[PDB]
């Protein structure tokens, strides 16, 4: 993670989990890495058991989380003096959105008994609405690159974790040393054997 906090000051990092430094002390095996862009006025409702506009139509959170969100200001890469409609938000779903699952659709949503199969009626609205990102807009109407990480347990033995603070070497002195999972005490001496290369 050492190379994590050199990507401008963040926006919100409230967490219900473990510390970043003990992420180095505890070796993991599976972590989710997904990202999206939301307007800055709609990031505050990203919380476990939270209700808001983008709460049950694009992305929802369960109780057990093991992680938190990372967000920061992005006004020099996704903001244009004209228009920016590349990103869109969906707010029309028929039923409940399950936590941690993705959904993509293009069919028009029917809010009632109106039969719609490609026509935009007064009760049938398109479920995909685009944003608009201009420098005229203030802080509350700017895109934030919200990225969230979730950790998983009991899937595999640990296979991914950061540096272990390797040190220098000393010779001809009574000091403690440890090897590749082979811990012991002894005197390091150059050998004359012929090891096979496996």
């Amino acid at each position: 993670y050492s190379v994590l906090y050199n990507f401008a000051p963040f926006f919100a990092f409230k967490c219900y989990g473990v510390s970043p430094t003990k992420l180095n002390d505890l070796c993991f095996t599976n972590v989710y890495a997904d990202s999206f862009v939301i307007r800055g006025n709609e990031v505050s409702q990203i919380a476990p058991g939270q209700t808001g506009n983008i709460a049950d139509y694009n992305y929802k959170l369960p109780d057990d989380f093991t992680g938190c969100v990372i967000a920061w200001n992005s006004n020099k890469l996704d903001s244009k003096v004209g228009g920016n409609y590349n990103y869109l938000y969906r707010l029309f779903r028929k039923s409940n959105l399950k936590p941690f699952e993705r959904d993509i659709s293009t069919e028009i949503y029917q809010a009632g008994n109106k039969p719609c199969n490609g026509v935009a009626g007064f009760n049938c609205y398109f479920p995909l609405r685009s944003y608009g990102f201009r420098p005229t807009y203030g802080v509350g109407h700017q895109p934030y690159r919200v990225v969230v990480l979730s950790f998983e347990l009991l899937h595999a033995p640990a296979t991914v974790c950061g540096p272990k603070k390797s040190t220098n070497l000393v010779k001809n002195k009574c000091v403690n040393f440890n090897f590749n999972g082979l811990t012991g005490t002894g005197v390091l001496t150059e050998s004359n054997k012929k090891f096979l290369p496996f």
Epitope: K80, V81, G82, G83, N84, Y85, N86, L88, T106, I108, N117, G118, V119, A120, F126, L128, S130
Partner: antibody, heavy 126, light 109 residues
């Protein structure tokens, strides 16, 4: 906004023509430019968009290798290289000004063509 | 599919006329319809966008709307000093591009 350019010179079939319109008064890093021709007696046809930021330009189904698009940031003007002109190319050329920006294939429904002015003319000729 | 449009139109001055643009299921309704108008011997210009917002630069004279298969461009009255063709444009998901209508002549009576 302005689109002042020069008139296109007549080119033989199996050759190349160049049509380019000047862009000024705005930064050329957010507006994708479109090319389209006014076919007489019928509608118009489209081949793709041009993005001056990244190398992500695509092509239409009926226009695979007919057009080749090159970009330039020093002059902020798109450049034309047409190949194998035919008898159906008898139309005037206008560079379509499109507002906004869009890359993926579900965001192009929101924009509209902004500015037309002083188009050129490229048609095949025997 | 290709959008088709009336070749011409006959409307006397002083009374409102409208132009219809028949389409398909995936081209009209689920996608916005844009109306292009071009002067003879000059450059074209957009008339109406998104079927409910009027562009700046024109007075409150024209009107455009969509109703299912066809989109209607209401022309409240007609002046004999300006006769301009109207183009019909839409977007299709299968064709993945812009397809344009034939265009309609307007004449006085």
């Amino acid at each position: 906004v302005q689109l002042v350019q020069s008139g296109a010179e007549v080119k033989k079939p199996g050759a190349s023509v160049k049509v380019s319109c000047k862009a000024s008064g705005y930064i050329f890093s957010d507006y994708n430019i479109h090319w389209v021709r006014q076919a007489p007696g019928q509608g118009l046809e489209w081949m793709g968009w041009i993005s001056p930021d990244s190398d992500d330009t695509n092509y239409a189904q009926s226009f695979q290798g007919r057009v080749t698009m090159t970009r330039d940031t020093s002059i902020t003007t798109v450049y034309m290289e047409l190949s194998s002109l035919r008898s159906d190319d008898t139309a005037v050329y206008f560079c379509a000004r499109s507002v906004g920006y869009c890359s993926l294939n579900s965001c192009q429904r929101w924009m509209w063509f902004d500015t037309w002015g002083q188009g050129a003319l490229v048609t095949v000729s025997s | 599919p290709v959008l088709t449009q009336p070749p011409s139109a006959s409307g006397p001055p002083g009374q409102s006329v409208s132009i219809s643009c028949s389409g398909s299921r995936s081209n009209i309704g689920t996608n916005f319809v844009y109306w292009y108008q071009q002067l003879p011997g000059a450059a074209p210009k957009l008339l109406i966008y998104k079927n409910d917002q009027r562009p700046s630069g024109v007075p409150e004279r024209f009107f455009g709307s969509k109703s299912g298969t066809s989109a209607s461009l209401a022309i409240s009255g007609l002046r004999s000093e300006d006769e301009v063709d109207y183009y019909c444009a839409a977007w299709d998901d299968s064709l993945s591009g812009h397809v344009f209508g034939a265009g309609t002549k307007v004449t006085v009576l």
